[PDB]
A paper describes a structure:
Ferritins are protein complexes that are involved in iron homeostasis and DNA repair by storing iron in cage-like structures. This protein complex is formed by 12 or 24 subunits with tetrahedral 23-symmetric or octahedral 432-symmetric arrangements, depending on the subfamily to which it belongs. Here, a straightforward expression and purification protocol is presented that provides an apoferritin, bacterioferritin B ([name]), from [name] with high yield and purity. Similar to as in S. coelicolor bacterioferritin, Fe2+ enters [name] from the B-pore and is converted to Fe3+ at the ferroxidase centres.
A 2.12 Å resolution cryo-EM structure of [name] is reported, showing the typical cage-like oligomer constituting of 24 monomers related by 432 symmetry. Part of this region was ambiguous in previous crystal structures but could be built within the cryo-EM map. The C-terminal region 164–181 consists of a flexible part (Cflex, 164–173) and a rigid part (Crigid, 174–181), as described by Khare et al.. We found the extension of the C-terminal end to be located within the interior of the [name] cage, which is remarkable as Mt-enc has been reported to encapsulate [name] via this C-terminal extension. Our EM map displays well defined density for Crigid, residues 174–181, including a double conformation of residue His175.
Numbering used by the authors:
A (entry chain W), B (entry chain D), C (entry chain H), D (entry chain G), E (entry chain M), F (entry chain A): 5 to 181
Write the structure that this text describes.
Amino acid sequence: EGPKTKFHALMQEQIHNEFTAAQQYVAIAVYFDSEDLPQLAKHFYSQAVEERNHAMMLVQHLLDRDLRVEIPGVDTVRNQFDRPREALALALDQERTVTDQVGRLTAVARDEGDFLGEQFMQWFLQEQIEEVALMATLVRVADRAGANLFELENFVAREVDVAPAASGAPHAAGGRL
Amino acid sequence: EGPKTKFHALMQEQIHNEFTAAQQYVAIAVYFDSEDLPQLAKHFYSQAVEERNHAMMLVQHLLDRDLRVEIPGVDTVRNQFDRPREALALALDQERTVTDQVGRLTAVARDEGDFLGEQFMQWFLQEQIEEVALMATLVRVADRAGANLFELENFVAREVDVAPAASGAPHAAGGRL
Amino acid sequence: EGPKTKFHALMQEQIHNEFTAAQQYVAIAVYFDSEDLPQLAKHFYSQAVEERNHAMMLVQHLLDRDLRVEIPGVDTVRNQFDRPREALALALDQERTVTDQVGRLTAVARDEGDFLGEQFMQWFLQEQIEEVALMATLVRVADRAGANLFELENFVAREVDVAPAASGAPHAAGGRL
Amino acid sequence: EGPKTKFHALMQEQIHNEFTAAQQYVAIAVYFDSEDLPQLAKHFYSQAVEERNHAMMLVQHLLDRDLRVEIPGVDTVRNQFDRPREALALALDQERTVTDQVGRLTAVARDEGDFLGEQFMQWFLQEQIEEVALMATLVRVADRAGANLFELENFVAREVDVAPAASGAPHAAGGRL
Amino acid sequence: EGPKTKFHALMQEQIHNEFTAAQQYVAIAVYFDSEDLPQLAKHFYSQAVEERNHAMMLVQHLLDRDLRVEIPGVDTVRNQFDRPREALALALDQERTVTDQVGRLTAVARDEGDFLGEQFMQWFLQEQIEEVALMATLVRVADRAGANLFELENFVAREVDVAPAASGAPHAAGGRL
Amino acid sequence: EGPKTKFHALMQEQIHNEFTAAQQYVAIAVYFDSEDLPQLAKHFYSQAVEERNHAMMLVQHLLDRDLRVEIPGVDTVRNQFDRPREALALALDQERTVTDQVGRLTAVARDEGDFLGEQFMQWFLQEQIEEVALMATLVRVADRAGANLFELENFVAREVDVAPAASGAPHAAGGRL
């Protein structure tokens, strides 16, 4: 209790960050749900679930290496939004922050010579590319729609496709939801 | 912002309590997972998911009545346990506390004359009976097994059965996981 | 317009290189086609298509990161060959050059601290191993066949197998052909 | 090397033109892709592929007549557009230019008394009618939609139908993609 | 014969190490077989086969890069064990040593600027995480079982699951067994 | 430890010999693989696997009689060959040597009055007939082909048939691969 490597410490923080991110995505979906944007709400419920899966993957990685892992609390998240665009903006900012965090985790792994950690990080880097692309798309399409939220909903219904999970995902503690 | 009924306030607290309970169940499952009790860990991963569903149901109820609902933070939960029995004890104590909370919610609904709330509460009362029974079973079987954790795992594998959800559950925001 | 990172610049050059490589593969296939080596021609038509897919993947990567991407021209390629071996040699030299280019792209990604780029590059490294192996095989088998082109064609028909794409390929702009 | 008929020369130029046209269609699709007009982008990715097929057909025709054929470079194409309409306009202008080119090829065939060439040209004339009609439709529908790009996308999704290739197409070198 | 890179040399040593590891796993399985622990013996026969596959993958990698590869001898392995736990301990120590070896191979690849080698190593890093986790589980469960070997066998039968190979494995010389 | 019968001792040596033979077959297959003789390489990968099975059968026989059995090391094998014929010659010489070894094992069994051993040996005698016949065929066909290795490969592809294992094989420790 005390000889924790930087990578171990950073991974525990990332588990906190991921659970917090999942909760923020839930808050955003509920906000959309209560503005009668079901398509957006459905998409973000899915996102909350997948963020939860990511946290479980970090947990599972710590279990597999027999490193001490704790399930954290969750910070309060944001529920007030003036307009749907502001919540899509928050989600884009969150995805970009997650990209930075995973990059920092990779860098710390490489610095400590923790090869296992570095390899494990690679899949998250890959997921981040696609996630950020989709959130940026949603933000741009929201700007184009402006006041007309129905067009935004129609774009989401036609163009935003739930993909069944590719293989290659790391195993999540408790199985991937 | 301010004319919130007691039932509305209490339901928002219950949403906080349920999310916290789900997180505590996750912590317990991870603890079991890292003690190599896969059967117990699998059961409690399921329990965490179902507690999450319950919180979503409370959320959905507030959405359906157009009452203000906020997704809360989550308190830190307990991760240290000296022995598996102590974690099964924590889970039993939590289920009993939840029974009290749902009973208090029912009582507050009845007091305010909120019939909709009272009816909605009924399903949770029903779920509590079965949940508490199962946790109490697990605690008694852990005592009987004592030091021999393999028997506990074998009991769980043979006797503890995931049931597909009966009908009659209230709808959960974002669909039941 | 001007703050382009080295990785962005290098990726745009690689898009030019890949389209050029696809066109050179087409030229080689047409050359084989007109020497009545259908098996070789069929193989290299496939190769041209797969190089095109690779270019589309680089394009898609730039789209996903919202980086400016331009579809380039294509340099003139080589059409004259004295003998089929000389064209298989050109193809081997091209595959090796591509290996260098992808390695340089990886190195530039690592240097700029562009983790997303580095991860994305990994799949191309992997494809290069197999591609170079197969081209080197074709060159050695051409030497062994010498003047007797029928044996070369028979080797290709029996031993060179189109594999359906494994999973794990990055997504190509416009879908993988 | 030097006794090339006008039809042979013109066909080699047309192969250059077709490859250039395919690349321009790719540039247009990528432009649409990066403006979040997936339906338009999908349509033009298809168009790029079909232009490539056309070039391959011209190649195959030269192979079948044992006429010298070279795979050319590709001119740089246009990537900047101020607004989607301007790119649909470019595509319409390109289809009309292609109609002129194929007509000139037919006329040159008839002039040299190259019956084989003339017959072969007929299928391209036929394809041009339909292609120009569709591009002109897209331009008119873009004008009607004006600023509202969502309507344009909806028109494309409902009304623009990929048809499986009719029979009667000439064979393409390397098989029709 | 003499300009061998460090990565080439280290890979040849790793091929020796992997074949030796496979043979040691066979010795362990035979030891379990002759102590009437069929479930453990079955698991370790599988492990021996999969270690053999790993060696074949390293071989295939050297074949694909046209690097000189030799099939080595195999060192004598350990057959005497005082108690099954001591053999599970040997297997855990071996898996950890393999993790170090693959990490050293990765580091040497990165040092020489051998990108192909580094990418190829990644899959082995990933396999090591899971393998070490499972061996550590077996050791802990053996300690918990103590003198009672039947519980150990029962844990293995219920909880240790042969997974069909995921995709993404590198190709093994002679096909994966 | 010391009252080992001649048959027991000889069987342990044979286990060493068989593992060595399997490794030599692997070396030969890899040699063929790296000369681009896939059909020969495939055949000898199969042979290596079947030699491994034979060693496992000898192991299993010692397990069934509760005789002490040790998994041995493996001698270094030959990897250099000047020409494919020289490796087919090595394989023929090895199969003939194995025939002698199994005959000596039978003779020693008969001498010690070990009926169980003698009966068990019979299946190996039978396998040797067919194996030697096939290797001798390959050598003669290689001589007939001479410099023209393609004919050798074609003979192997058409005439050398993997047969599913007949019944009557003795059981192999860890199941027959």
